């Protein structure tokens, strides 16, 4: 924000970072006066994000949530602040914290394929039938996304959602087998 | 909740206190199955807004009432269905 001993505003900096297309000339956004407009105060300062306050400061994200709630074009005020909360959860995960689930069927719902469930802080190394110990050998921090229910692993062979370990299939020479199926060579029996 | 050594459900207790009009025989409500509908009510009631009120009035009943008010909402904005329960809890705290 310092071009030459001059305190740049975010508008000026953002306009300075412009890179336009050849035939597409773009007009810089017009700085508009404030519209003179606290849901976020309850959740951000509540216990639901408590284990995240100590690592990432919430004032900037509080202001961001206020702006998002005021600037959005539908009166889904409870469901129009999901983006800022998700970003704060992402920053908490990046800060070494362990955010707990804050969504719900009516409050910012997320849809997951098959029988997976949406979670805010779980290991990104999903366990599959081929790699059933992947999560125990993961180096990245926990992330938010769709994960298999505890006690099962993903089916990367039949693509049939999360299945228990005992029902995982096996692959030999490009052909998928079944739990209990056998193959044999000259001197092995598997 | 006791009529003769028995246990009365809240619906039965409410129906027992009816006093109908001379010509308006209002029908008793029909029980409905539960719609199965930590959340916003928990964050609001367990937050720092009500700190000296929790130690005086228990929140659990009013938290449950907040959840019911949210589930039976008529509008889309969830922040508008929690006003009644929060106001009632503030009244009880006073
Ligand atoms: Cu990271």
Tab-separated table of N, CA, C and O in Angstrom, chain A residues 7-76:
chain	number	residue	atom	x	y	z
A	7	UNK	N	0.269	6.259	1.336
A	7	UNK	CA	-0.592	5.196	1.848
A	7	UNK	C	-1.699	4.929	0.835
A	7	UNK	O	-2.637	5.717	0.699
A	8	UNK	N	-1.593	3.812	0.122
A	8	UNK	CA	-2.587	3.451	-0.879
A	8	UNK	C	-3.830	2.869	-0.222
A	8	UNK	O	-3.746	2.141	0.770
A	9	UNK	N	-4.988	3.196	-0.784
A	9	UNK	CA	-6.236	2.579	-0.376
A	9	UNK	C	-6.399	1.228	-1.067
A	9	UNK	O	-5.762	0.964	-2.088
A	10	UNK	N	-7.235	0.342	-0.515
A	10	UNK	CA	-7.482	-0.940	-1.194
A	10	UNK	C	-7.997	-0.779	-2.615
A	10	UNK	O	-7.647	-1.588	-3.485
A	11	UNK	N	-8.813	0.244	-2.874
A	11	UNK	CA	-9.272	0.507	-4.236
A	11	UNK	C	-8.098	0.793	-5.164
A	11	UNK	O	-7.997	0.220	-6.255
A	12	UNK	N	-7.194	1.680	-4.737
A	12	UNK	CA	-6.050	2.039	-5.569
A	12	UNK	C	-5.145	0.841	-5.812
A	12	UNK	O	-4.673	0.630	-6.933
A	13	UNK	N	-4.890	0.046	-4.773
A	13	UNK	CA	-4.042	-1.133	-4.919
A	13	UNK	C	-4.665	-2.144	-5.875
A	13	UNK	O	-3.998	-2.660	-6.783
A	14	UNK	N	-5.961	-2.420	-5.700
A	14	UNK	CA	-6.635	-3.354	-6.588
A	14	UNK	C	-6.637	-2.889	-8.030
A	14	UNK	O	-6.459	-3.691	-8.951
A	15	UNK	N	-6.843	-1.587	-8.250
A	15	UNK	CA	-6.772	-1.055	-9.605
A	15	UNK	C	-5.355	-1.126	-10.159
A	15	UNK	O	-5.169	-1.314	-11.366
A	16	UNK	N	-4.348	-0.970	-9.296
A	16	UNK	CA	-2.962	-1.100	-9.730
A	16	UNK	C	-2.636	-2.526	-10.150
A	16	UNK	O	-1.778	-2.733	-11.015
A	17	UNK	N	-3.300	-3.516	-9.555
A	17	UNK	CA	-3.068	-4.911	-9.906
A	17	UNK	C	-3.904	-5.375	-11.099
A	17	UNK	O	-4.171	-6.574	-11.224
A	18	UNK	N	-4.321	-4.458	-11.968
A	18	UNK	CA	-5.140	-4.815	-13.119
A	18	UNK	C	-4.278	-5.281	-14.287
A	18	UNK	O	-3.176	-4.771	-14.510
A	19	UNK	N	-4.790	-6.262	-15.034
A	19	UNK	CA	-4.152	-6.749	-16.260
A	19	UNK	C	-5.272	-7.069	-17.248
A	19	UNK	O	-5.898	-8.129	-17.163
A	20	UNK	N	-5.512	-6.154	-18.183
A	20	UNK	CA	-6.684	-6.236	-19.041
A	20	UNK	C	-6.426	-7.103	-20.271
A	20	UNK	O	-5.285	-7.417	-20.625
A	21	UNK	N	-7.521	-7.491	-20.920
A	21	UNK	CA	-7.491	-8.231	-22.170
A	21	UNK	C	-7.187	-7.292	-23.336
A	21	UNK	O	-7.341	-6.075	-23.217
A	22	UNK	N	-6.731	-7.837	-24.480
A	22	UNK	CA	-6.378	-6.973	-25.617
A	22	UNK	C	-7.526	-6.107	-26.112
A	22	UNK	O	-7.415	-4.877	-26.140
A	23	UNK	N	-8.633	-6.733	-26.506
A	23	UNK	CA	-9.772	-6.020	-27.067
A	23	UNK	C	-10.825	-5.656	-26.031
A	23	UNK	O	-11.821	-5.016	-26.380
A	24	UNK	N	-10.637	-6.041	-24.774
A	24	UNK	CA	-11.614	-5.799	-23.716
A	24	UNK	C	-11.076	-4.706	-22.798
A	24	UNK	O	-10.258	-4.974	-21.910
A	25	UNK	N	-11.534	-3.477	-23.011
A	25	UNK	CA	-11.212	-2.373	-22.121
A	25	UNK	C	-12.186	-2.359	-20.953
A	25	UNK	O	-13.402	-2.458	-21.140
A	26	UNK	N	-11.645	-2.234	-19.746
A	26	UNK	CA	-12.422	-2.346	-18.520
A	26	UNK	C	-12.405	-1.029	-17.761
A	26	UNK	O	-11.388	-0.328	-17.728
A	27	UNK	N	-13.540	-0.697	-17.153
A	27	UNK	CA	-13.685	0.504	-16.348
A	27	UNK	C	-13.458	0.159	-14.883
A	27	UNK	O	-14.036	-0.807	-14.372
A	28	UNK	N	-12.614	0.939	-14.217
A	28	UNK	CA	-12.350	0.703	-12.806
A	28	UNK	C	-13.625	0.923	-11.997
A	28	UNK	O	-14.431	1.799	-12.334
A	29	UNK	N	-13.849	0.143	-10.939
A	29	UNK	CA	-15.074	0.306	-10.149
A	29	UNK	C	-15.163	1.691	-9.526
A	29	UNK	O	-14.162	2.267	-9.092
A	30	UNK	N	-16.378	2.221	-9.485
A	30	UNK	CA	-16.612	3.554	-8.924
A	30	UNK	C	-16.678	3.441	-7.404
A	30	UNK	O	-17.478	2.646	-6.885
A	31	UNK	N	-15.864	4.201	-6.663
A	31	UNK	CA	-15.957	4.159	-5.197
A	31	UNK	C	-17.283	4.710	-4.701
A	31	UNK	O	-17.574	5.899	-4.871
A	32	UNK	N	-18.098	3.851	-4.088
A	32	UNK	CA	-19.422	4.288	-3.679
A	32	UNK	C	-19.438	4.666	-2.203
A	32	UNK	O	-18.720	4.072	-1.392
A	33	UNK	N	-20.250	5.661	-1.834
A	33	UNK	CA	-20.367	6.016	-0.422
A	33	UNK	C	-21.032	4.898	0.360
A	33	UNK	O	-21.800	4.098	-0.204
A	34	UNK	N	-20.761	4.795	1.660
A	34	UNK	CA	-21.362	3.716	2.453
A	34	UNK	C	-22.879	3.830	2.502
A	34	UNK	O	-23.448	4.924	2.469
A	35	UNK	N	-23.534	2.674	2.578
A	35	UNK	CA	-24.989	2.592	2.592
A	35	UNK	C	-25.583	2.787	3.981
A	35	UNK	O	-26.810	2.783	4.114
A	36	UNK	N	-24.746	2.949	5.008
A	36	UNK	CA	-25.194	3.134	6.389
A	36	UNK	C	-26.066	1.959	6.839
A	36	UNK	O	-27.230	2.113	7.215
A	37	UNK	N	-25.475	0.770	6.792
A	37	UNK	CA	-26.166	-0.448	7.193
A	37	UNK	C	-25.518	-1.067	8.428
A	37	UNK	O	-26.094	-1.057	9.516
A	38	UNK	N	-26.739	-7.892	14.780
A	38	UNK	CA	-25.443	-8.499	14.531
A	38	UNK	C	-25.477	-10.013	14.587
A	38	UNK	O	-25.155	-10.612	15.614
A	39	UNK	N	-25.873	-10.632	13.474
A	39	UNK	CA	-25.964	-12.090	13.421
A	39	UNK	C	-24.587	-12.719	13.594
A	39	UNK	O	-24.412	-13.661	14.376
A	40	UNK	N	-23.585	-12.198	12.879
A	40	UNK	CA	-22.252	-12.794	12.920
A	40	UNK	C	-21.635	-12.730	14.311
A	40	UNK	O	-20.773	-13.553	14.642
A	41	UNK	N	-22.051	-11.764	15.132
A	41	UNK	CA	-21.470	-11.624	16.462
A	41	UNK	C	-21.748	-12.845	17.332
A	41	UNK	O	-20.906	-13.222	18.154
A	42	UNK	N	-22.915	-13.468	17.172
A	42	UNK	CA	-23.250	-14.626	17.996
A	42	UNK	C	-22.386	-15.832	17.646
A	42	UNK	O	-21.814	-16.475	18.533
A	43	UNK	N	-22.276	-16.160	16.356
A	43	UNK	CA	-21.541	-17.363	15.975
A	43	UNK	C	-20.032	-17.161	16.038
A	43	UNK	O	-19.310	-18.037	16.524
A	44	UNK	N	-19.532	-16.022	15.546
A	44	UNK	CA	-18.088	-15.814	15.506
A	44	UNK	C	-17.498	-15.720	16.909
A	44	UNK	O	-16.416	-16.260	17.169
A	45	UNK	N	-18.187	-15.043	17.823
A	45	UNK	CA	-17.736	-14.931	19.203
A	45	UNK	C	-18.247	-16.057	20.091
A	45	UNK	O	-17.866	-16.124	21.265
A	46	UNK	N	-19.093	-16.941	19.565
A	46	UNK	CA	-19.626	-18.034	20.346
A	46	UNK	C	-18.632	-19.167	20.519
A	46	UNK	O	-17.534	-19.173	19.963
A	47	UNK	N	-19.042	-20.151	21.322
A	47	UNK	CA	-18.209	-21.325	21.559
A	47	UNK	C	-18.010	-22.151	20.294
A	47	UNK	O	-17.010	-22.873	20.191
A	48	UNK	N	-18.924	-22.041	19.326
A	48	UNK	CA	-18.842	-22.844	18.111
A	48	UNK	C	-17.533	-22.605	17.367
A	48	UNK	O	-17.009	-23.522	16.726
A	49	UNK	N	-16.991	-21.390	17.444
A	49	UNK	CA	-15.697	-21.063	16.860
A	49	UNK	C	-14.645	-20.764	17.919
A	49	UNK	O	-13.591	-20.205	17.596
A	50	UNK	N	-14.910	-21.127	19.180
A	50	UNK	CA	-13.998	-20.772	20.266
A	50	UNK	C	-12.598	-21.322	20.015
A	50	UNK	O	-11.609	-20.579	20.074
A	51	UNK	N	-12.500	-22.610	19.693
A	51	UNK	CA	-11.219	-23.242	19.442
A	51	UNK	C	-10.491	-22.687	18.236
A	51	UNK	O	-9.400	-23.150	17.893
A	52	UNK	N	-11.092	-21.692	17.581
A	52	UNK	CA	-10.477	-21.003	16.460
A	52	UNK	C	-10.116	-19.556	16.753
A	52	UNK	O	-9.338	-18.972	15.989
A	53	UNK	N	-10.653	-18.960	17.818
A	53	UNK	CA	-10.383	-17.550	18.091
A	53	UNK	C	-8.925	-17.347	18.486
A	53	UNK	O	-8.304	-16.340	18.122
A	54	UNK	N	-8.351	-18.297	19.227
A	54	UNK	CA	-7.002	-18.128	19.755
A	54	UNK	C	-5.931	-18.124	18.669
A	54	UNK	O	-4.807	-17.684	18.931
A	55	UNK	N	-6.245	-18.599	17.465
A	55	UNK	CA	-5.266	-18.684	16.387
A	55	UNK	C	-5.451	-17.632	15.307
A	55	UNK	O	-4.464	-17.065	14.834
A	56	UNK	N	-6.686	-17.354	14.901
A	56	UNK	CA	-6.977	-16.373	13.860
A	56	UNK	C	-7.856	-15.290	14.463
A	56	UNK	O	-8.908	-15.586	15.045
A	57	UNK	N	-7.424	-14.037	14.333
A	57	UNK	CA	-8.215	-12.918	14.823
A	57	UNK	C	-9.504	-12.796	14.021
A	57	UNK	O	-9.523	-13.006	12.805
A	58	UNK	N	-10.592	-12.446	14.712
A	58	UNK	CA	-11.922	-12.471	14.112
A	58	UNK	C	-12.433	-11.091	13.717
A	58	UNK	O	-13.494	-11.002	13.078
A	59	UNK	N	-11.723	-10.019	14.069
A	59	UNK	CA	-12.223	-8.685	13.766
A	59	UNK	C	-12.371	-8.436	12.278
A	59	UNK	O	-13.404	-7.941	11.816
A	60	UNK	N	-11.341	-8.785	11.505
A	60	UNK	CA	-11.417	-8.625	10.055
A	60	UNK	C	-12.534	-9.479	9.471
A	60	UNK	O	-13.294	-9.022	8.609
A	61	UNK	N	-12.659	-10.721	9.939
A	61	UNK	CA	-13.722	-11.584	9.436
A	61	UNK	C	-15.085	-11.172	9.972
A	61	UNK	O	-16.097	-11.392	9.300
A	62	UNK	N	-15.140	-10.557	11.155
A	62	UNK	CA	-16.394	-9.976	11.621
A	62	UNK	C	-16.853	-8.860	10.691
A	62	UNK	O	-18.025	-8.802	10.296
A	63	UNK	N	-15.932	-7.968	10.318
A	63	UNK	CA	-16.271	-6.901	9.382
A	63	UNK	C	-16.663	-7.472	8.023
A	63	UNK	O	-17.598	-6.977	7.378
A	64	UNK	N	-15.956	-8.512	7.572
A	64	UNK	CA	-16.293	-9.146	6.302
A	64	UNK	C	-17.687	-9.758	6.340
A	64	UNK	O	-18.443	-9.658	5.367
A	65	UNK	N	-18.044	-10.407	7.453
A	65	UNK	CA	-19.376	-10.985	7.578
A	65	UNK	C	-20.447	-9.903	7.604
A	65	UNK	O	-21.515	-10.068	7.004
A	66	UNK	N	-20.187	-8.794	8.303
A	66	UNK	CA	-21.135	-7.680	8.282
A	66	UNK	C	-21.328	-7.153	6.867
A	66	UNK	O	-22.463	-6.907	6.435
A	67	UNK	N	-20.231	-6.981	6.126
A	67	UNK	CA	-20.328	-6.498	4.753
A	67	UNK	C	-21.108	-7.474	3.877
A	67	UNK	O	-21.954	-7.059	3.079
A	68	UNK	N	-20.833	-8.773	4.011
A	68	UNK	CA	-21.537	-9.769	3.208
A	68	UNK	C	-23.024	-9.794	3.529
A	68	UNK	O	-23.862	-9.890	2.624
A	69	UNK	N	-23.372	-9.716	4.816
A	69	UNK	CA	-24.777	-9.703	5.206
A	69	UNK	C	-25.481	-8.459	4.684
A	69	UNK	O	-26.633	-8.529	4.240
A	70	UNK	N	-24.805	-7.310	4.726
A	70	UNK	CA	-25.421	-6.070	4.271
A	70	UNK	C	-25.482	-5.973	2.750
A	70	UNK	O	-26.439	-5.404	2.213
A	71	UNK	N	-24.496	-6.523	2.043
A	71	UNK	CA	-24.372	-6.310	0.607
A	71	UNK	C	-25.085	-7.357	-0.242
A	71	UNK	O	-25.156	-7.186	-1.464
A	72	UNK	N	-25.613	-8.424	0.351
A	72	UNK	CA	-26.186	-9.489	-0.459
A	72	UNK	C	-27.669	-9.234	-0.722
A	72	UNK	O	-28.366	-8.589	0.064
A	73	UNK	N	-28.140	-9.755	-1.856
A	73	UNK	CA	-29.356	-9.275	-2.504
A	73	UNK	C	-30.606	-10.084	-2.175
A	73	UNK	O	-31.643	-9.870	-2.811
A	74	UNK	N	-30.548	-10.999	-1.212
A	74	UNK	CA	-31.735	-11.729	-0.795
A	74	UNK	C	-31.820	-11.721	0.724
A	74	UNK	O	-30.808	-11.635	1.421
A	75	UNK	N	-33.046	-11.804	1.232
A	75	UNK	CA	-33.265	-11.785	2.676
A	75	UNK	C	-33.172	-13.185	3.273
A	75	UNK	O	-34.015	-13.613	4.061
A	76	UNK	N	-32.128	-13.910	2.890
A	76	UNK	CA	-31.742	-15.148	3.563
A	76	UNK	C	-30.605	-14.866	4.542
A	76	UNK	O	-29.521	-15.444	4.468
